[PDB]
Amino acid sequence: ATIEVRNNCPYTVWAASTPIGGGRRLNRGQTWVINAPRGTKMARIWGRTGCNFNAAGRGTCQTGDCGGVLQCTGWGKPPNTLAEYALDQFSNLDFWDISLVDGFNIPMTFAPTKPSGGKCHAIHCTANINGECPRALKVPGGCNNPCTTFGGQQYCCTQGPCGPTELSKFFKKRCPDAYSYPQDDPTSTFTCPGGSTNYRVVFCPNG
């Protein structure tokens, strides 16, 4: 239920969190701890780079912008590396993952503060994705996922079952534990017994 967001990047990051949390400027080394009640589903945490806000919480960001506002209520504009989770009250299990479906912008580590074996352990995505990003998907500060750039069933899996693509394999290749495309569920979903642990999301785990 407790999620700790830590910015270990050498640059400032504007953490964002829905549906609870909002937004927060995080300078190098700063942490933000938010409480997520049991039953919180379809939640996500991400970081925003190159933002420019004025006293009122209005401005714009280079990546992951959520409507030109500091405290998000909606989703960020890709590309942005995602930390998704659902604290299910029915199975009493925590379902979480790192997703690249909406792109990549900042490397991160998603981990249980109390790993208990099985699929309940830290996962990472620290590859140099922005650096090796295919030219067709590359944007300032990030690397978009083929579904965002090209669209269509092939990449977005909007019409029905889909499979990996050469462009999706570019991400899975570099971050095996993360979602490379919409239906990359089997090797991208992790769980922990609900109530048995807390969570930590850190930007630039390798500094």
Binding site for Cl ion (CB under 5 A): 1, 37
- Could you tell me the smallest distance in angstroms from the CB atom of residue 1 to Cl ion? 5
Closest CB to Cl ion among residues 37, 207: 37
- Could you tell me the smallest distance in angstroms from the CB atom of residue 39 to Cl ion? 9
Closest CB to Cl ion among residues 1, 157: 1
Of all residues in this chain, which one has the CB nearest to Cl ion in the complex? 37
User: For residue 91, which of 185, 1, 187, 191 has the smallest C-alpha distance?
Assistant: 191
Closest CB to Cl ion among residues 1, 156: 1
Closest CB to Cl ion among residues 4, 28: 4
- Could you tell me the smallest distance in angstroms from the CB atom of residue 80 to Cl ion? 26
- Could you tell me the smallest distance in angstroms from the CB atom of residue 35 to Cl ion? 6
